[PDB]
Design a binder for this molecule. Structure first.
Ligand SMILES: [K+]
Ligand SMILES: [Mg+2]
Ligand SMILES: [Mg+2]
Ligand SMILES: [Mg+2]
Ligand SMILES: [Mg+2]
Lengths: 69, 56, 51, 61, 413, 129, 51
RNA sequence: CCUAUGCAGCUUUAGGGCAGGUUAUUAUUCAAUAAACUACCUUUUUUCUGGGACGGACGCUCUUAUUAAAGAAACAAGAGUGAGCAAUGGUUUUUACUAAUUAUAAAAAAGAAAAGCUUAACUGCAAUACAAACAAUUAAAGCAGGGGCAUUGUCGGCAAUAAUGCAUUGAAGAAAUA
């Protein structure tokens, strides 16, 4: 990644080493039947909503919408 | 009668009926029939475990 | 091959004897999916030998 | 079992491959015994190739 | 329909039984339910003020029997157990000795009870043995708590049961009636202020006649279970009814059969009750009770430890396994025992002649750690006796005894 | 209980008014097994939720009571009627249930009437026999 | 971190490969095991266990 | 008058919803579902611009003026394009030929046409450079495998300069786990 962008990520605390996280349930002898969860597909869609989305992907905060009544 | 949703009920006969059956016979009849005619007239009782042992 | 409870007994046996508790029992066998990963089933009190 | 079946299919296909190649080459060769354009002495060899090769391939298709 | 819709139906689960908390009763049965399930004195007072004229004999009895449960003890006099939940005979806390009621609840209970007592007298002749037993039990509870000093209707309740050679009981008696009558009378003669001389004579005379004629002669003890039999034994012990031992043997037999159902708080009561009565020939009964502490060690409290040790010393029953359990439990609960309580416990071990290393070792460590020790004459001799009787030697007990003597000499009243 | 209150506060303003009206009828009908059901709508293209109330279908019937020798008008839901028929009728329903479970003034008054009448007839019959 | 609207960081693809579970183990080098034995912190005359 | 992270009211055959009534279907002795009509709720309705509206325009190539290194803007000017080809690709032989493209002084050991055989319009990698805010975009010696035409040279599409679209979501072939 370009130097200017990389420093900002490091300055914010980005330290990931692998594409995903390891699964403790896969270690032999450490399988907990209670904490069973079928493997899910990772979501690739960023949250770009300017009201409740990521602050790093919008210029400024927008007012929330009205509730149905 | 379990899935009849109240439309069908088990009936215990105390006296001989023209079409429902004879005394002591446990049969299935429409809920409306028992509600309006058989029950108030005193010719039958609902097929509860206590009634079946006592009468059936 | 050690399980979660077995590993505790191996590392801290005194944690069980001081409380007068029996040590954890060892496993019977490992799942066949791990064949080629382990050679023997560990014993909670290891058997030491001379070298 | 699935791996064994898949290997069997590939082996059978490769056994028949040499014959398929021979037909592929043969179907695109001009048979001069069925050409009457030469008797006409009007068209070039390339035009003869297109006229008869296309008819043979389309009929086979 | 571009935007597809999914519909879910959510059912709102509600309790099966109604708690009469906010609605006003409008019927004979509804009023009874609201009174019975009342949660606070303000609710009971509100019901009486509004529906005063729509009351019957049953309504007055129900209100009286539930009032003792609405009077709560101080939070400072209760200690919560770790993870214990309400169950059959088990509470989530244990009470310190001589627990006091809440400061702001006494005037309310006294005021409410005075109104009830005023309107009750006309209904005295329409009571059944069940209703009489519950009233006696309720008043005994109301005397143990600082609500009343005497039962105005005690003379009438006792006469009603006594009439016609206990004819009313002969037809409408159950196991609960005998347990409540004896237990209630005991709490009306010992709790709080000691007694009146005339009251003591009447209560003791009635109990003796009731026990012999009903439970013994007519064999009504067949209606009693382990818990009810234990309650009767406690009542007899407090009344010091040591003359008749035939009933004591019968009650002990019932306890022996249903030993499994008793908790440590009930086993200790049996030990103390037998010790007070002096019945020490039932070694087999003692052995069965001792075997009940093996598994229920998590339900023992300092009161149970103190009672068990003192009862064993008085009875002369020495069980090494039971004493070992009490010593180890006491060693951890040293912070809960009082100075006077912990001296009696030490003396109990000395009388039995049992030396418990962990128990005495913990006590010696605590005493030495204290910079300034002040031992009172009331229990100074008890702690010295325990060390001498227990055989504690020069290791560190002489230093503890030395400090004990110095503190005693420091005052010498 | 906490979840029930949380759901109720999310109802549409008009659905709240309907809910209160339904609850105010408890003392006028034989509540029985009547229960409250909430309708929730979700959509695929947006993260929006709509909460609304599901009405109760009330039935007017006349059930026979041998103790009272009368056909008693009653307002019931289908589930309550099915339960009464299964248990053995109105008389068995009232005599096999405590006052706490009724949760209705109309039901409580009717039950109290039946219980008192049953005792009087039983006592007289018992003395005769 | 906002870049004005270009949003250049989210123009890259996503990978979903799961790393091996063995990344959760403690790694011990053979050269480090020997150094302890040479210094005298480990007894090489008897079986060495994880304890 | 113009400019906003703009606000509000009103209108409709702008998008979505059903939550009152009517209507349709179904079910129990005041009910459930809804691409309909009325009522109600909520949301959207670019920018550039010799001020704004109206009109026009938004990607990618060639050429003209700002000289003969490169680069260089305006609602400046003059022309193209959102493809085609199973040969119009690859490679050998022959010779009375040396053209054409949207536009253009490319090119003779080179091309075009004619005749023959072919599928490199490949699989897995790659030193070093051009350009460039970044993303991407451009040229490429060389190594291993399987091939084509020659018989030891060339082929990783087309004389060259345009014929295009990130991520996400969805789908297909195969393979590895669980
Ligand atoms: K101007
Ligand atoms: Mg503008
Ligand atoms: Mg770059
Ligand atoms: Mg070659
Ligand atoms: Mg080429």
């Amino acid at each position: 990644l370009h130097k200017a962008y990389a420093k900002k990520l490091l300055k914010l605390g980005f330290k990931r080493r692998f594409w995903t996280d390891p699964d403790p349930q896969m270690v032999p002898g450490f399988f907990d039947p209670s904490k069973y969860k079928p493997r899910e597909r990772l979501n690739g869609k960023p949250n770009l909503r300017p009201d409740i989305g990521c602050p790093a992907l919008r210029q400024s905060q927008r007012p929330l919408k009205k509730l149905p009544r | 009668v379990e899935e009849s949703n109240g439309k069908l009920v088990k009936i215990v006969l105390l006296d001989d009926v023209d079409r429902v059956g004879q005394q002591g016979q446990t049969v299935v009849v429409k809920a409306g029939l028992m509600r309006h005619l058989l029950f108030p007239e005193g010719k039958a009782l609902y097929a509860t475990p206590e009634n079946e042992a006592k009468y059936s | 091959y050690y399980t979660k409870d077995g590993l505790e007994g191996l590392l801290f046996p005194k944690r069980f004897t001081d409380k007068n508790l029996p040590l954890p029992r060892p496993a019977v066998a490992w799942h066949p999916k791990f064949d080629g990963k382990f050679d023997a089933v560990g014993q909670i009190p290891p058997v030491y030998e001379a070298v | 079992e699935k791996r064994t079946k898949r290997a069997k299919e590939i082996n059978d296909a490769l056994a028949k491959m040499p014959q398929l190649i021979a037909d592929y080459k043969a179907a695109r060769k001009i048979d001069w015994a069925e050409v009457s354009i030469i008797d006409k002495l009007t068209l070039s060899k390339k035009q003869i190739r297109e006229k008869y090769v296309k008819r043979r391939l389309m009929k086979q298709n | 329909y571009r935007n597809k819709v999914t519909i879910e139906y959510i059912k709102l689960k509600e309790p099966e039984n109604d708690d009469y908390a906010t609605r006003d009763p409008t019927n004979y049965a509804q009023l009874l339910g609201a009174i019975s399930i009342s949660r606070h004195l303000d609710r009971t007072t509100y019901l009486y003020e509004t529906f005063k004229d729509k009351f019957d004999t049953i309504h007055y009895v129900t209100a009286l029997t539930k009032l003792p449960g609405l009077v709560h003890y101080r939070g400072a006099d209760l200690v919560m157990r770790d993870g214990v939940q309400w169950s059959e005979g088990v509470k989530p806390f244990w009470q310190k000795p001589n627990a006091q009621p809440r400061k702001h609840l006494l005037p309310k209970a006294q005021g409410l009870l005075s109104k009830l007592e005023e309107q009750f007298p006309p209904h005295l002749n329409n009571l059944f043995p069940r209703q009489t037993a519950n009233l006696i039990w309720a008043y005994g509870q109301l005397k143990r708590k600082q609500v009343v000093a005497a039962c105005p209707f005690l003379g009438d309740f006792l006469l009603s049961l006594r009439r016609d050679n206990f004819l009313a009981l002969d037809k409408h008696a159950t196991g609960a009636d005998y347990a409540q009558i004896v237990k209630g009378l005991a709490n009306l003669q010992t709790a709080g202020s000691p007694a009146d001389e005339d009251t003591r004579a009447l209560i003791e005379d009635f109990v003796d006649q009731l026990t012999q004629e009903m439970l013994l002669r007519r064999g009504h003890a067949r209606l009693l279970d382990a818990r009810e039999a234990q309650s009767i034994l406690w009542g007899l012990g407090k009344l010091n009814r040591r003359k008749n031992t035939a009933i004591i043997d019968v009650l002990c037999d019932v306890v022996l059969a249903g030993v499994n159902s008793l908790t440590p708080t009930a086993l200790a009561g049996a030990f103390s009750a037998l010790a007070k009565l002096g019945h020490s020939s039932r070694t087999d009964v003692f052995e069965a009770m001792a075997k009940g502490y093996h598994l229920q060690t998590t339900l023992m409290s300092p009161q149970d430890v103190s009672l068990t040790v003192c009862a064993c010393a008085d009875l002369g029953f020495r069980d090494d396994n039971l004493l070992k359990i009490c010593g180890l439990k006491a060693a951890d609960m040293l912070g809960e025992f009082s100075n006077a309580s912990l001296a009696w416990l030490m003396a109990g071990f000395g009388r039995l002649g049992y030396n418990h290393e962990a128990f005495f070792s913990a006590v010696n460590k605590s005493v030495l750690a204290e910079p300034v020790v002040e031992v009172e004459p009331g229990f100074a001799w008890r702690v010295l006796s325990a060390y001498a009787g227990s055989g504690r030697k020069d290791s560190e007990s002489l230093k503890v005894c030395g400090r004990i003597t110095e503190a005693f000499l420091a005052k010498l009243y | 209980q906490q979840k029930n209150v949380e759901i109720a506060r999310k109802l549409l303003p008009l659905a709240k008014k309907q809910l209160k009206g339904l609850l105010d009828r408890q003392d006028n009908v034989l509540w029985g097994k009547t229960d409250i059901v909430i309708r929730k709508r979700t959509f695929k293209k947006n993260d929006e939720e709509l909460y609304s109330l599901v009405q109760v279908q009330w039935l007017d019937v006349k059930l026979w009571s041998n103790i009272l020798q009368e056909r008693v008008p009653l307002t019931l839901s289908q589930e309550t009627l099915t339960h009464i028929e299964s248990i053995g009728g109105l008389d068995d329903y009232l005599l096999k249930t405590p006052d706490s479970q009724m949760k209705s003034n109309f039901s409580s008054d009717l039950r109290w009437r039946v219980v008192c009448e049953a005792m009087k007839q039983g006592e007289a019959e018992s003395k005769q026999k | 971190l906002y870049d004005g609207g270009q949003l250049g960081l989210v123009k890259f693809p996503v990978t979903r490969q799961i790393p091996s579970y063995e990344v959760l183990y403690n790694q011990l080098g053979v050269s480090k095991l020997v150094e302890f034995i040479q210094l005298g912190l480990l007894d090489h005359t008897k079986t060495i266990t994880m304890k």
